[PDB]
Amino acid sequence: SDFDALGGRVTTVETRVETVNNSLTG
Amino acid sequence: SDFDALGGRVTTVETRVETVNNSLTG
Numbered sequence: 001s002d003f004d005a006l007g008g009r010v011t012t013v014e015t016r017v018e019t020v021n022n023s024l025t026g
Numbered sequence: 027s028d029f030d031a032l033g034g035r036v037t038t039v040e041t042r043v044e045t046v047n048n049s050l051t052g
Contacts, residue, residue, distance in 0.1 A: 013040045020047045
């Protein structure tokens, strides 16, 4: 249906979590 | 359908990651 953008946004937040984690642990 | 609750959980996580980033970087 239209939850394809929802699936994209989940991947976005998945990448963002790792980005924040590695930035702050650095 | 019944994934709008999933659409709310993804948004609350998408703002939770930002609040975690801001709280820890502070």
